Design a protein around this ligand. Sequence first.
Ligand SMILES: [Mg+2]
Ligand SMILES: [Mg+2]
Ligand SMILES: [Mg+2]
Ligand SMILES: [Mg+2]
Ligand SMILES: [Mg+2]
Ligand SMILES: [Mg+2]
Ligand SMILES: [Mg+2]
Ligand SMILES: [Mg+2]
Ligand SMILES: [Mg+2]
Ligand SMILES: [Mg+2]
Ligand SMILES: [Mg+2]
Ligand SMILES: [Mg+2]
Ligand SMILES: [Mg+2]
Ligand SMILES: [Mg+2]
Lengths: 129, 101, 81, 103, 32, 132, 99
Amino acid sequence: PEITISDEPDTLYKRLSVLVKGHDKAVLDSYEYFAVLAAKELGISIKVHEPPRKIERFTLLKSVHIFKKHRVQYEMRTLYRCLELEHLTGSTADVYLEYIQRNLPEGVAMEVTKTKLEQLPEHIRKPIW
Amino acid sequence: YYVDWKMLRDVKRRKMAYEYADERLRINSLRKNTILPKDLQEVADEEIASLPRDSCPVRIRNRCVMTSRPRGVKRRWRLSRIVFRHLADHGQLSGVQRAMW
Amino acid sequence: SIRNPKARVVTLRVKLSSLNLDDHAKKKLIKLVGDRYCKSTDVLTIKTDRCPLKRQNYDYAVYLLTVLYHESWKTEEWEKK
Amino acid sequence: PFQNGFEEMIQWTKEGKLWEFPINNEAGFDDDGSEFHEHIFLDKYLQDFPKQGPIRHFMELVTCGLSKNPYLSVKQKVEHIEWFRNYFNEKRVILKESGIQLN
Amino acid sequence: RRKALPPRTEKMAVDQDWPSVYPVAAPFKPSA
Amino acid sequence: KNRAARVRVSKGDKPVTYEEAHAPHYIAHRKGWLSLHTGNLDGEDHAAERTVEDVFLRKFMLGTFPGCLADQLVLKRRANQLEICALVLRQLPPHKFYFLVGYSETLLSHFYKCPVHLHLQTVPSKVVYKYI
Amino acid sequence: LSEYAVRMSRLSARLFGEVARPTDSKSMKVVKLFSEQPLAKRKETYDWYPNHNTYFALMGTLRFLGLYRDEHQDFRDEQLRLKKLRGKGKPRKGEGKRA
RNA sequence: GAACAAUAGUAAGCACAAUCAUAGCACAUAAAAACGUUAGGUCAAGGUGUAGCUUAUGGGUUGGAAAGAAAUGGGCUACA
Ligand SMILES: [Mg+2]
Ligand SMILES: [Mg+2]
Ligand SMILES: [Mg+2]
Ligand SMILES: [Mg+2]
Ligand SMILES: [Mg+2]
Ligand SMILES: [Mg+2]
Ligand SMILES: [Mg+2]
Ligand SMILES: [Mg+2]
Ligand SMILES: [Mg+2]
Ligand SMILES: [Mg+2]
Ligand SMILES: [Mg+2]
Ligand SMILES: [Mg+2]
Ligand SMILES: [Mg+2]
Ligand SMILES: [Mg+2]
């Protein structure tokens, strides 16, 4: 394993918001367990919650030719877990998330939002034009 | 082989429509403007009327990609109802369950 | 494909109270920006979409911030009108 | 030979077959090394055009359109404009005939 | 010529550490 | 009378796979999904492609591996790689099995332009869930 | 409505990069039009169908290279053989009608 | 081919029932509902057995259709 250190002042993250979409509630439970257990070992200080489930239903005809009295209806459920992490470094995020994503199960998707901390841009600091 | 002749026809209309897309766009821009002179717009009118009309967008028909059926297709899977159901009911379609509530 | 269109989008949250603004400059910037300013929480927001790459949207959002600040301090004729 | 599954993935990734982690969806697309002011600000390409004519109305519109357009490179945006230069310049006749003198 | 070899579960050491056996993402072989 | 993906009651002697014995209304209740991918979740794209793709791999595996296929073929998509699991009956002499492993992986990988992983679990005889 | 209001409006828009001078609801469609991806260009349209010739021909060759096995075309085959055998085949082009 | 103070019935299977879903109960609804019946529906979803077409019952381009004397099915809006 090769580590390098570059002089530049690595990025801070106030809040790292990680959403996992899924079909089966089980998979998202065990994955929560895994993520929390990874984070507890890396000193990451995290929370988790369950956002409201989405259920999308729609309707098809039940026969090939004609009985329109008769339909079938189908569903897709989308279940959510969100891991909300606070006060992370740049590298910390890169690694932790790398470990998360690498192990992402096949039935699930993940949506990451970082909120990054930057002091002030250079042309605004206290010049005025 | 595409499954039907109708499919060949519409494959080709897709390729056409990708071909001329920017001619269409550009020309139609003048044509849809109230700021330009009418004089420009008449000539341009003749110009989009000029280009082959198998290359026009609305002449395109989504079909079931496997089965070719012109109606009954569900946009997301680009499948006919019959084929879709057929798949979903062996369980070969992920995340689709028969809906109860 | 790893291409997801939704990724481009960048947001800026900036608290106006943390800003070096003149009285005149603050008020002019409020009127200037409009809805992107929340008058209750003082959070100026900028969403950027327009450009294919994330870095670009970052640059442009920074650009907008910069610009709005530079323009809020400039008094003009019609302002006195 | 492959000593382990980790070995496997490793060779895939060096090779370019596996993805990079953590994912940035813009990986592999550099967009020409362009920057935001090479998209948003289109003054460059409007330099040859009548400055007070309705032509400016129109082309300022097209400007705004292509300024807001994520799905195109700089080279294509340019091509649109140049197509309009070519187009308007090709018809001098119709410009003169509509009640405005156009350059 | 028919081949029946007993599963790895037969040679498995009761205390043998698991991640040795299943390091990465896997199909679930019932044999191993 | 729903004929959908169902297997009729015989004189009672007919061997039936656990999957073919569990009727469509049973998906997600007892039976699982034969494929897995992101595409049908709320905010997601390109579901169609993974469907065409899936279909073609059903036909492909049925055709490359004649008479030796046990139960329907289990596809998983993980981070751009395919994991194709199969229950395969033991008919072939093992050499041929590995020939076709290499053959399949390579061919598919170069077709779908993404790395494919193949797994054969070999079974002495079709598992019987019911009758027999 | 005021002039101050108007000048602020202009200022804001020309800043954020939206429409500059006052323009009709009609003409704005041009802006909307380039600002988008034209319908025919969307990958969700032109790439709609999988190339069918590719799958068909690839599995076809792969049949004769001995690798793939097509039960459908084998059924087809055997049937065609048994139809030509009984004495009804597919006429040499041009021969059938006039005779 | 049953009688339970029982008289020739036993039987795993598939149905019903039971459980699942409608985010905790319960009920309700949803779903499910075999064997057969109606030679019920559909060779225009697709696929096929038998037959036919092959300088054409095949493949393309350009136009053209979907008019109301009425008769009736279902809706919508009213009659305040
Ligand atoms: Mg249409
Ligand atoms: Mg019913
Ligand atoms: Mg319950
Ligand atoms: Mg009940
Ligand atoms: Mg019912
Ligand atoms: Mg029941
Ligand atoms: Mg009949
Ligand atoms: Mg009848
Ligand atoms: Mg037919
Ligand atoms: Mg036939
Ligand atoms: Mg004809
Ligand atoms: Mg016609
Ligand atoms: Mg009447
Ligand atoms: Mg009414």
